[PDB]
Amino acid sequence: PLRDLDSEHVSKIVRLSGIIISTSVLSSRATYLSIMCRNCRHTTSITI
Amino acid sequence: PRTLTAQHLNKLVSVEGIVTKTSLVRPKLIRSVHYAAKTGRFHYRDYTDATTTLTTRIPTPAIYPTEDTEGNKLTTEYGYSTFIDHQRITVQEMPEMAPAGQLPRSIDVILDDDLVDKTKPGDRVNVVGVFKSLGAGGMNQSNSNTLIGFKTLILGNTVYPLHARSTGVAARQMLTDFDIRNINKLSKKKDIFDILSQSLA
Ligand SMILES: [Zn+2]
After folding, report:
1. Whole-angstrom distance between the N-terminal and C-terminal Cα of chain B?
2. What residues does B130 pair with on adjacent strands?
3. Backbone angle region of B101, left / alpha / beta, with phi > 0 → left and psi within -120 to 50 → alpha
4. Where in this chain does the entry annotate a coiled-coil region (chain B)?
5. First and final CA of chain A: distance in angstroms?
6. Ligand 1 mean position to B61 CA, how many Å?
7. Residues B118, B174: Cα–Cα separation, whole Å
8. How far is A26 from chain B (nearest CA, A)?
């Protein structure tokens, strides 16, 4: 039950049941970034 | 060099003196060219510093590129890059004009490209250029020290060697057609040896 979750379950895997009442709008997050330095123009990359 | 003071800064001057020490002529990197093996393209970059222009500019310290904009490796093409010659010299007050018993004064002159090896140490020289200051005389940051001032030198554009007695610079005179005609005429007389001999001292 949703009312039975507590400290012992933190960071473990759980299975829960209920009813969806609200979904939000889609957001954007980065998975690969190409960056540059605005002074010396040194370039690199980042991966998520 | 003795009578060159802070009131002549940023103005065009002409100085006389004796060359005391030159420097090794070095190349300066201006444009680099590279190659990417994964794409087959050639790239380049330009470089500049504070002594290549008379007016102050906002610095743009670009780095030397080793990679591509997409991460690929690059290869340097030394034959397609560009280098320019560079030298620095020192000029002192002439020994035949400086006061006796007094330590002398000197000034540095920077030359570039086609005026790079026009004199050797010990010559009497005349250099025309712009007397200019550079950097910050310990003003940026705290820099508690106050003894030093502003670095100064001459960005030269004209160098003239001068002939003197008992020096290594030889005298040469430009010969005009009037002179050539007169010489070739006098060559045809018969006492020319006598005339030329009696003229000495
Ligand atoms: Zn940077």
Report:
1. 37
2. B12, B155
3. left
4. none
5. 34
6. 9
7. 19
8. 29
Interface residue A40 vs chain B (CB under 8 A): yes
Asked if residues B67 and B74 have their Cβ atoms less than 8 Å apart, the reply is yes
Minimal CA separation from B17 to chain A, in Å: 42
3-state secondary structure chain A: CHHHCCHHHCCCCCCCCCCCCCCCCCCCCCCEEEEECCCCCCEEEEEC
Question: Which chain B positions have a beta carbon within 8 Å of A45's beta carbon?
Answer: 71
**What are B8-14's contacts with CB under 8 Å, separation 24+?**
B8/B131, B9/B131, B9/B132, B9/B133, B9/B152, B10/B130, B10/B131, B10/B132, B10/B133, B11/B130, B11/B131, B12/B128, B12/B129, B12/B130, B13/B128, B13/B129, B13/B130, B13/B131, B13/B154, B14/B126, B14/B127, B14/B128
From ligand 1's centre to the CA of B75, what distance in Å? 22
